[PDB]
Amino acid sequence: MEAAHSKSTEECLAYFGVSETTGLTPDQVKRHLEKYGHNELPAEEGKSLWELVIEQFEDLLVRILLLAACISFVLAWFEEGEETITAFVEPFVILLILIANAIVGVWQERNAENAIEALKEYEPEMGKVYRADRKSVQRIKARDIVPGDIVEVAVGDKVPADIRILSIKSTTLRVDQSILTGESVSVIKHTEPVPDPRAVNQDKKNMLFSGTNIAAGKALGIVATTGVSTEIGKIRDQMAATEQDKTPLQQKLDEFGEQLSKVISLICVAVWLINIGHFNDPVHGGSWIRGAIYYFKIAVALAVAAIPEGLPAVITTCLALGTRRMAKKNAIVRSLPSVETLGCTSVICSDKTGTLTTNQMSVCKMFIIDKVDGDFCSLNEFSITGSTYAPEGEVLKNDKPIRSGQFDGLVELATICALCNDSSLDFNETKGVYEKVGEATETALTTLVEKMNVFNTEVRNLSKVERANACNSVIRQLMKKEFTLEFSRDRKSMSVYCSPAKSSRAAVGNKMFVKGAPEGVIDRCNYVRVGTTRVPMTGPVKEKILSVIKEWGTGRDTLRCLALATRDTPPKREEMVLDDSSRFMEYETDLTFVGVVGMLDPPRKEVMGSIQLCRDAGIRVIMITGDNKGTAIAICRRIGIFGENEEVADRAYTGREFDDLPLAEQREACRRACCFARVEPSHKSKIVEYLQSYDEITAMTGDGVNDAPALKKAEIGIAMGSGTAVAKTASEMVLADDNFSTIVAAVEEGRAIYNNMKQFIRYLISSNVGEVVCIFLTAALGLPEALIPVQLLWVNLVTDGLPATALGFNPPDLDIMDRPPRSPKEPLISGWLFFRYMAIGGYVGAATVGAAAWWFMYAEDGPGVTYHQLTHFMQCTEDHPHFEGLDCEIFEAPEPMTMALSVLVTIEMCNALNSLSENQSLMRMPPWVNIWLLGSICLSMSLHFLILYVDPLPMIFKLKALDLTQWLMVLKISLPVIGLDEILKFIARNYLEG
Ligand SMILES: Nc1ncnc2c1ncn2[C@@H]1O[C@H](COP(=O)(O)OP(=O)(O)CP(=O)(O)O)[C@@H](O)[C@H]1O
Ligand code: ALF
Ligand SMILES: [K+]
Ligand SMILES: [Mg+2]
C-alpha cells in the first residue's frame, strides 16, 4: 500500500503499525493478505482458446469462400447429370484449401511462449520474513508475503517484493537491478529518504525492487507493495496486451479483401440486372430450379474467380524463403510477416548496454606520473585496446604499442589492480568465451592486468582456460593478501593489506593497496610515486593529476575513473580494528599516489557503420538507455548519433527531464531527440508510442527485461542473443550472434520482400479480375460456362502459384538502400496501374470466352454451330429455332472448356513475363533472366499437360486438347497479351508521369 521511498524508516514502520524487531501479527497478515491479496503477477491469461481459429474466419478468404463451399455443397447434392460421380469435389476442395490455409495460421501461433511467464522467473519461490509468532526468521512462500512485514535479504537472494530498506546489516549493500535499469553494475543502497515523489528507480537508492538480486550484503526492510503494484508488476502490465497485432503489410491486405468483397456481392447484383429476364420473357416456366442452379453456379464461380486462393501460400513462402535467408545471418525470425516490416521502418530505437555496446567494462585509458620538478608535472598516459573481458588488446603510448613492464609505474598500477580486487576472469568453455566473476568494474581491472602483463610472463602457449587469470596469478604469488578493508560509502574506497611472499630478510615490505573515488583517495595521498621513487605531493602536482581526471571524466570520453595509491608504511596488523569500517578511512592515509584508470562499457565494433548505413537508407537511430546521461551521450558521439563536437542540449533527455515536458513538448521531443538516458522501462514504450503516433514504423532493439515493453510496442522488436530470455520472448527477431550490422541486412531484406510481394500480387490479381471477366460473358451472353471453379482453383492455386513465387526470386532492386522508407499511407494499386491489369485482365477474360466461342461459331473441327443463337441451350429437345436435331447436348462438351482454360494457362505464362517487371519491357530487358521463372513455367505447363493426358484427372477437368487443333489456336489467342502489356508498358516508359 505504501507510496513512498520519500518517507523515513520510521514513517514506514508507522504506516503499517509494526515493530521492526518483531514483525507482523497473524491478525495483520490476515487483513493485508485480504486487502492486497497475494504477492505475485497473474500469468497472462487475458484471452485464449483451442478455438483460436474460430476468429480467423472474418475476411473474404473465408466468409466469401465459405458460402461458396456450402452454397456449392448443396448444388453438388442435386447433380442429376450422368456425372453423379465427379460431383461434389468443389465443396471439398474449397474446404480442403480453406482448412489448409487456416491450419497454417495456427501451427504458427501455437508457438508463442509468453514474456509474462519468462518474466515470472524473476519471482523467488521463498522469502525470509520476521513475523510476531516467532523469534526466529521464517522462510515462507514469497507469495504469502504482504505489504508491511519485515523482510530479510542477503547475497544471492532475489528480492521478493518492493521493499523500503530499514537496516543494512553489512558494511555495504550492493544490488543488481539490471532487470529495471538494464545495468548489472551494483548500486549501493542506503536508508535515508529519497524525498522526490517523482524520482525514478535509478534515484530510489533506499528501495529494494521485487525481482532484483543482492550482489552482496544483508539487510532488513519492510515490504512496501506486492504483486502487480510493483515495478516489475508494471513491466507485467504492459506485457498483457489484448491489442491484436496489426502488421503494416497485413492491414492493406485486409481492406483489400474488404473492397474486393464489396465488388463480389455487388457484381452478383450486376448479374441480376442483365439476367432476371425470366420475369418478363421466358414464358413463365422453364425448369424453375434452373434459376437457383444458374444464379448459384456462377455466384460461387465469381467467388472463386475473384479471390486469389493461391496468394496466402505464395506469400507465406516468400516470407519463409527470406526467414531462412536471414537465418544464415544468424538473424532468427520468430514471426514470419516481420521480415518485411523491417524494410519500411523509419525509426530504430535502441537499448544501449549490451546492444549498441558489448557490456564489458573496459579500462581504455590510464596514466601515471612521468616527471616532477618544481611547478612542473608531466604524466605518462596510455591507452588500452580491447572492448571485451578477453585478455586480448594491447597497451599503447602515443598510439604506438609498448611493453607495460618497461614502466615501474605500470608495474605498481597492475599490482594494485590485481590485489585490490575481488573479481576474477573465467573462460566458459561451453560458450567458448571469457566471462566475469564479480563486479564488472573490478573484472575490468582483472582483464587490464592480463592485457598489461607487467612481468612479461610467457602466455602464448597457454590454454584459454588457463590464460584467464595467468598474469593476475603471478602478482598474487608475489604479495600475500593478508586481509581486505571493504569499500564503505563514507570513504568511497577500499583496500587490501598485503605481506611479501619471499623475503626472510627482516625487512617487511608490508603494504596496503588502495583504489577508489579519485577525489577521496588523492586527498589522502602525501606522496606521489615516480617510477620507483617517492616524492612529496605538492599542490601543482595534485593539480595536474586532478586536471586530467577532470578531463577523462567528462569529455567525448566520459570515463569511470578510479585512483590507485599505496600506503608504503601501513599500520601494524594487530593495531587495526577490522570490525568497524568507520575506522578504515584513517588506515588509508599517508598514501603514495600511483596512477589512474578510466573505464567504459564500449561500443561493439560494427555499431557505428550500421548507424551510418541506416542513415543512408533514411532510418533514424535513437538511444533509450537506463544508464546515465553523460555515458549515454558519449557513446552516442562514438557511434555517430552525435558529432564529436556537437553540442547536444535539446537532443538528449533523462527520463525525469522528459517527464517535465508538457505532453505536447514530449511528443515533439521524440521527433528531434536521440539519447534518452536514466529512463524507466515505461519510458521506452512511451517513446515508441509517440513515434508511432506520427504514423512512423519503429523498431525497438535491445536485450534487457526493461526493454520488453518497448520490444512489444514497436512494430518490430529485435533481441540480442546474449540478452535476457524475456527480451527474446518479446521480440520477433533475435540476432543470435549479437551482430548489430545484421539489422541493416534485415531491412534490405525487408525492402526486397515487399518489392517482390507487390510484383507477384499484381500478377496474381490480373488473372482474378480476368477470370471474372470470363464468368461475366460466360453468363451475360448466356454462353456455356467457359470455365468451372475446379479449374479456377487449380489455376489460381498452382499454375499461377508457381511463377508467382519465381517472382519472389526476382532480382533485388539494387540501390534499394539508397532510397528512403516507403510511406505507410502508400497505395499499392495506382489510378493507372489499376488501368493496366484491368486492361489486361479484361482482354484475357474475353479471350477464353472467345475460345468457347470458336469451338462452336467457327468450330473448325468438332461440333460447330456458326452464328448460332447460344442464348439458350435447354432448347436441345425442341430443335425449331435451330434445326440440327439429334445433335443434342454438345454444349456440355469437355473440349470447349479445355480451350478456354489452355488459353488461360498460356496467357498466365506470358503475363508472368510482362510481370517479370513493371515498366521494364521485355524489349529492352531480356525475358530470359529468371532461370527460376522459366523453371516454374515449365513446371506449370508440364503440369497442365499432366492435367490433360492423365488418368483420374481430365475427368475432374475436361478432355485432352489435340495438337494441330486445340493448341495452335490456344497459342494464337495468347501471343497478343505480350503486345497488349508491351504497349501499356510503353505508355509508362515513354510518356508516363515518371
Ligand atoms: N569496491 C570499490 N572500490 C573502490 N571504489 C569504488 C568501489 N565501488 C565503487 N567505487 C567508487 O564509488 C564512487 C561512488 O559510488 P556510489 O555508488 O557510492 O554512488 P555515487 O556517489 O557514484 C552517485 P550515482 O550513483 O548517482 O552516480 C564511484 O566513483 C566509484 O568510482
Ligand atoms: F542496456 Al539499457 F537502457 F537497459 F542501455
Ligand atoms: K513487437
Ligand atoms: Mg540492455
CSV table of N, CA and C and ligand atoms in Angstrom, one decimal, residues 178 181-183 351-357 359 625 684 701-707 720 723, ligand 4:
chain,number,residue,atom,x,y,z
A,178,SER,N,19.6,-4.9,-13.0
A,178,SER,CA,19.7,-4.7,-14.4
A,178,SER,C,18.4,-5.1,-15.1
A,181,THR,N,17.1,-1.3,-14.8
A,181,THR,CA,17.9,-0.2,-15.3
A,181,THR,C,18.7,-0.7,-16.5
A,182,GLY,N,18.7,-2.0,-16.7
A,182,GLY,CA,19.5,-2.6,-17.7
A,182,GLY,C,21.0,-2.6,-17.5
A,183,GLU,N,21.5,-2.1,-16.3
A,183,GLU,CA,22.9,-2.2,-15.9
A,183,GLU,C,23.1,-3.1,-14.7
A,351,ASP,N,18.1,0.2,-27.1
A,351,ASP,CA,18.8,0.0,-25.8
A,351,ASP,C,20.3,0.2,-26.0
A,352,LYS,N,21.0,0.8,-25.1
A,352,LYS,CA,22.5,0.9,-25.2
A,352,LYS,C,23.3,-0.3,-24.7
A,353,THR,N,23.2,-0.6,-23.5
A,353,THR,CA,24.1,-1.5,-22.9
A,353,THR,C,23.8,-2.9,-23.2
A,354,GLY,N,24.8,-3.6,-23.7
A,354,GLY,CA,24.6,-5.0,-24.3
A,354,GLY,C,24.1,-5.1,-25.7
A,355,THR,N,23.7,-4.0,-26.2
A,355,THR,CA,23.1,-3.9,-27.6
A,355,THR,C,24.0,-3.1,-28.5
A,356,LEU,N,24.0,-1.8,-28.3
A,356,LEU,CA,25.0,-0.9,-29.0
A,356,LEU,C,26.4,-1.1,-28.5
A,357,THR,N,26.5,-1.7,-27.3
A,357,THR,CA,27.8,-1.8,-26.6
A,357,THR,C,27.9,-3.2,-26.2
A,359,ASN,N,29.0,-4.4,-23.2
A,359,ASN,CA,28.6,-4.7,-21.8
A,359,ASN,C,29.8,-5.5,-21.2
A,625,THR,N,18.2,4.6,-23.0
A,625,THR,CA,19.0,3.8,-22.0
A,625,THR,C,18.7,4.1,-20.6
A,684,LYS,N,10.4,3.7,-22.4
A,684,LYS,CA,10.9,3.2,-23.6
A,684,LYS,C,9.7,2.9,-24.5
A,701,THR,N,15.2,-2.2,-30.5
A,701,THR,CA,16.3,-3.1,-30.4
A,701,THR,C,16.9,-3.1,-29.0
A,702,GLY,N,17.0,-4.2,-28.3
A,702,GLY,CA,17.7,-4.3,-27.1
A,702,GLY,C,17.8,-5.7,-26.5
A,703,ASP,N,18.0,-5.9,-25.2
A,703,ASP,CA,18.3,-7.2,-24.7
A,703,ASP,C,17.9,-7.4,-23.2
A,704,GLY,N,17.3,-6.4,-22.6
A,704,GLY,CA,17.1,-6.4,-21.1
A,704,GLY,C,15.6,-6.7,-20.8
A,705,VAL,N,15.3,-7.1,-19.5
A,705,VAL,CA,13.9,-7.2,-19.2
A,705,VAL,C,13.2,-5.8,-19.2
A,706,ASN,N,14.0,-4.7,-19.1
A,706,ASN,CA,13.5,-3.4,-19.1
A,706,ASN,C,13.1,-2.9,-20.6
A,707,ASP,N,13.6,-3.7,-21.5
A,707,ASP,CA,13.4,-3.4,-23.0
A,707,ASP,C,12.1,-4.0,-23.5
A,720,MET,N,18.9,-9.3,-28.7
A,720,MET,CA,20.3,-9.8,-28.9
A,720,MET,C,20.3,-11.1,-28.2
A,723,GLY,N,21.2,-11.5,-24.7
A,723,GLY,CA,20.3,-10.9,-23.8
A,723,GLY,C,19.4,-11.8,-23.0
B,4,MG,MG,20.5,-3.8,-22.1
